[PDB]
């Protein structure tokens, strides 16, 4: 009765790193990314990553439960933390 988000690193560059966030159990979930420092996102497929502040809200658009996001280093190289929220 609980969902989760598995994030893996696919390609890694010297100015940013791609990420692969996914969730199982169901597609109606709420992915929440929490970058650290000032990292930012400039790409997102299979999910819409919008929001403001040090957190980012993510929701499904009727495509699947596996989406990827592109984060920029900016002095950071640790992927963000995603959390599935669906009561």
Curated annotation (Swiss-Prot):
Domain CBM2 per the UniProt entry, residue ranges: 1-87
Domain of life: Bacteria
Family under the similarity heading: Belongs to the glycosyl hydrolase 11 (cellulase G) family.
Function: Endo-acting xylanase which displays no detectable activity against polysaccharides other than xylan. Hydrolyzes glucosidic bonds with retention of anomeric configuration.
Protein name per the record: Bifunctional xylanase/deacetylase
Organism listed in the record: Cellulomonas fimi
Residues of the full protein shown: 247 to 333 of 644
